[PDB]
Amino acid sequence: RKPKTGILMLNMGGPETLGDVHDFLLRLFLDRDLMTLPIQNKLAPFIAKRLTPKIQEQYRRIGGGSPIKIWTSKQGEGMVKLLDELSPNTAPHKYYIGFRYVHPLTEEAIEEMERDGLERAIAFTQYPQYSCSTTGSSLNAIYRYYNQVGRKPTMKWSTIDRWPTHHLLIQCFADHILKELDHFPLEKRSEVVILFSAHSLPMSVVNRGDPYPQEVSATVQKVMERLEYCNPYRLVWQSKVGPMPWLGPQTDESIKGLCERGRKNILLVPIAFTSDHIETLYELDIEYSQVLAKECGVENIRRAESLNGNPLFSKALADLVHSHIQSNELCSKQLTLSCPLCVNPVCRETKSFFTSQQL
Amino acid sequence: RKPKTGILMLNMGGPETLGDVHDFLLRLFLDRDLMTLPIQNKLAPFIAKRLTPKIQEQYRRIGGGSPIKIWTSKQGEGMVKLLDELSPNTAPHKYYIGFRYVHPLTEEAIEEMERDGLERAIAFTQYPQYSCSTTGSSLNAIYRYYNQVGRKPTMKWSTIDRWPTHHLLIQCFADHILKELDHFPLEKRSEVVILFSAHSLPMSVVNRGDPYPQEVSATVQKVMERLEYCNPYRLVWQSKVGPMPWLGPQTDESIKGLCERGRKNILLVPIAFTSDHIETLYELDIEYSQVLAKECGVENIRRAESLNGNPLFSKALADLVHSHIQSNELCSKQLTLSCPLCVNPVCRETKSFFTSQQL
Ligand SMILES: CCCC1=Nc2nc(CNc3ccc(Cl)cc3)nn2C(=O)C1
Ligand SMILES: CCCC1=Nc2nc(CNc3ccc(Cl)cc3)nn2C(=O)C1
Ligand code: FES
Numbered sequence: 001r002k003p004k005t006g007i008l009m010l011n012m013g014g015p016e017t018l019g020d021v022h023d024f025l026l027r028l029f030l031d032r033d034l035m036t037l038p039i040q041n042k043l044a045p046f047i048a049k050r051l052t053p054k055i056q057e058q059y060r061r062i063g064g065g066s067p068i069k070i071w072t073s074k075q076g077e078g079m080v081k082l083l084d085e086l087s088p089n090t091a092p093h094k095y096y097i098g099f100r101y102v103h104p105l106t107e108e109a110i111e112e113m114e115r116d117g118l119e120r121a122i123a124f125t126q127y128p129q130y131s132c133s134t135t136g137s138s139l140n141a142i143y144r145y146y147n148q149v150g151r152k153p154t155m156k157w158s159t160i161d162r163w164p165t166h167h168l169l170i171q172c173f174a175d176h177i178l179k180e181l182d183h184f185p186l187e188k189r190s191e192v193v194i195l196f197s198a199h200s201l202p203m204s205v206v207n208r209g210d211p212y213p214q215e216v217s218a219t220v221q222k223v224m225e226r227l228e229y230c231n232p233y234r235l236v237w238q239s240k241v242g243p244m245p246w247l248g249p250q251t252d253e254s255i256k257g258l259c260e261r262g263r264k265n266i267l268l269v270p271i272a273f274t275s276d277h278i279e280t281l282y283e284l285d286i287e288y289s290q291v292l293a294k295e296c297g298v299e300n301i302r303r304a305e306s307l308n309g310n311p312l313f314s315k316a317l318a319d320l321v322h323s324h325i326q327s328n329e330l331c332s333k334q335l336t337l338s339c340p341l342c343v344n345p346v347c348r349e350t351k352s353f354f355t356s357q358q359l
Numbered sequence: 360r361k362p363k364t365g366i367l368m369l370n371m372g373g374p375e376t377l378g379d380v381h382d383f384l385l386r387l388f389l390d391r392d393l394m395t396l397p398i399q400n401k402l403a404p405f406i407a408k409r410l411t412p413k414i415q416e417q418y419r420r421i422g423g424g425s426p427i428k429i430w431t432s433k434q435g436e437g438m439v440k441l442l443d444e445l446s447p448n449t450a451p452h453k454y455y456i457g458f459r460y461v462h463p464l465t466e467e468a469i470e471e472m473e474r475d476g477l478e479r480a481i482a483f484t485q486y487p488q489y490s491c492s493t494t495g496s497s498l499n500a501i502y503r504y505y506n507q508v509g510r511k512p513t514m515k516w517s518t519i520d521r522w523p524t525h526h527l528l529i530q531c532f533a534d535h536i537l538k539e540l541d542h543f544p545l546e547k548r549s550e551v552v553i554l555f556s557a558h559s560l561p562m563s564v565v566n567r568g569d570p571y572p573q574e575v576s577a578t579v580q581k582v583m584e585r586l587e588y589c590n591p592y593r594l595v596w597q598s599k600v601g602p603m604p605w606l607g608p609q610t611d612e613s614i615k616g617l618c619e620r621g622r623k624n625i626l627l628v629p630i631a632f633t634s635d636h637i638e639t640l641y642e643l644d645i646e647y648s649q650v651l652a653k654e655c656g657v658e659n660i661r662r663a664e665s666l667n668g669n670p671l672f673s674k675a676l677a678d679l680v681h682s683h684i685q686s687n688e689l690c691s692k693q694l695t696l697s698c699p700l701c702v703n704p705v706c707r708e709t710k711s712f713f714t715s716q717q718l
């Protein structure tokens with residue numbers, strides 16, 4: 001039977017092999033929604049070639065590439081198997097992967113969805129918490145695609161544009177935290193500090209009204225509420241690059257600071273990610289948990305397992321799509337409000353693209 | 360009958376009359392927990408005398424002084440009346456007001472509680488969301504009082520040090536938002552943007568790991584959950600002072616930004632305050648809603664009523680104390696973890712003061 005409903009899973013993506021690193025970095029630094037550097041179409045290629053060896057070396061240290069596509073695929077397969085049973089009037093369902101910076105690109109996925117002749121298309125961001133830098137840029141690419149080709153879509157579009165507090169997402173995080181708490185020495189379990197580590201944002205993005213920090217904070221609160229506040233916690237921020245101000249405190253300085261103040265039993269939680277990638281496998285697990293932690297005299301530092309192949313996460317994705325379909329929603333209420341200090345004209349056009357869709 | 364249980368309600372306070380402004384500013388700029396300044400003991404009286412006319416004029420604009428003491432007293436009386444019936448084994452209950460920067464000062468309240476011979480003393484911060492600059496500095500003052508006086512307490516101490524998601528606090532905000540939504544023209548109700556406006560913090564405090572922004576975000580999420588996401592919202596930050604970086608976006612810039620982008624129907628919500636004071640009556644209601652809003656061409660800008668005399672809020676306070684008593688908690692789990700980049704040694708001493716209390 002031909003596919004009736006397409007679920008486009010949106011992520012920035014990462015290079016699968018060392019050979020993919022250069023083009024990954026090229027697309028990243030060309031992303032005007034992320035950064036407006038001068039002589040962009042010529043300054044970004046210089047940055048890409050200069051940083052490729054360093055970034056190749058990071059991926060070599062975690063096994064040669066990013067696992068994002070593998071995990072996204074497994075999660076999508078499970079989502080589809082459930083949806084075909086959950087929602088037979090919109091079946092058969094097909095998942096598509098739309099990466100921002102590597103193949104398959106969002107634009108290639110849209111071409112395939114259209115070639116498949118879908119009736120309905122769901123832009124399903126894989127970022128639970130919305131940032132203009134993540135979900136916003138992915139959604140812009142969908143709007144831009146139809147604007148560049150100059151023709152209108154042959155499928156009815158809608159988006160699941162955020163889901164920071166979905167009860168099954170929360171249950172997954174709480175399950176992985178408890179599982180990891182069990183791996184500390186029993187005499188130190190109560191002593192463990194839970195560091196929720198989310199990707200940071202430049203302060204210039206925070207200060208123009210990006211909803212990401214507040215939504216990440218809501219995920220943290222719902223998790224800790226499900227855990228009945230069993231351990232103390234803090235929300236800290238990782239992966240800052242460059243010389244500009246970013247939202248802190250930084251994860252690495254917070255680890256170092258806890259250690260120097262007698263808190264040497266630490267549980268890291270990647271609260272803004274749904275699978276492993278360079279920011280967990282390299283930044284948290286190598287740079288912080290092995291190098292920094294040893295330098296500071298950590299007793300035990302562990303990290304909750306990424307959601308990856310947990311079947312409850314696939315259930316969460318299918319439940320989100322099912323509710324989205326039954327409610328006839330085109331987007332969240334939050335998407336109808338663009339950032340108060342937004343300077344990009346595309347954001348309003350992308351918003352209107354989804355709110356005006358024929359049902 | 361002799362009072363048995365004292366509830367010390369902690370707030371920064373504000374000057375009741377124009378004559379109180381100078382000493383209010385003096386204590387404010389002498390507070391090393393709130394800000395560090397060179398030669399503070401001679402610099403602060405310079406700043407205090409310089410700023411007194413300006414600040415007296417702000418208070419003149421809202422009727423001659425701060426209403427905080429009035430509202431705190433009404434809230435405390437209602438709390439006590441309920442507690443005497445909720446918890447007769449700890450009755451009679453008596454509330455005490457402990458202001459940081461005006462009379463009655465935290466130190467004066469502690470003296471009175473001790474003189475009254477209470478069996479039990481509860482440090483009940485009136486900030487639902489914890490910052491080291493608000494609740495932390497108030498709790499430090501309790502520890503420092505016993506440290507300076509050289510004696511030990513004659514009453515058993517505990518603290519309710521935060522409550523950002525208490526279900527009755529959330530209901531009060533939701534009720535006031537709905538009531539104010541009804542005062543917009545019906546044809547614009549759906550169009551209203553809800554700006555949750557919380558007092559900002561300097562980035563130097565945020566980057567230390569202060570828990571405030573995450574907890575404020577959690578209050579916002581629970582309110583909007585109760586409101587069923589009926590309107591788009593943003594969390595923005597007010598009351599920045601000085602030239603250093605603070606957490607944004609600023610409330611004033613956000614109002615102006617919305618107006619220039621076509622969102623001319625705005626509901627302000629003071630999400631980190633429990634009553635009116637200068638930041639609502641002057642900054643929000645005069646500086647932003649009358650002057651700024653008129654210059655930008657707002658159609659309707661309103662503000663949810665502060666919780667003030669709402670009897671449901673008094674029920675929330677009594678429910679908090681009652682549950683605190685039943686559970687034998689000395690403090691939240693979160694208080695047992697100091698800021699990872701905290702450089703102030705009193706914070707740990709204060710923490711230990713409460714965790715170590717005889718039950
Ligand atoms: C306005 C452009 C300035 C820039 N904004 C940026 N954001 C990021 C990473 N964003 C991110 C957030 C959450 C998650 Cl889950 C993953 C990724 N990198 N970056 C830059 O290099 C320049
Ligand atoms: C002219 C005064 C200089 C300063 N004023 C400051 N205010 C604060 C945060 N206060 C705060 C109040 C209420 C709430 Cl709900 C939350 C937070 N920090 N701070 C400084 O460091 C210096
Ligand atoms: S920047 Fe957030 S909407 Fe354009």
Ligand code: FES
Pocket residue numbers: 491495567569697698700701702703706707
């Ligand atoms: S600064 Fe937060 S504990 Fe001292």
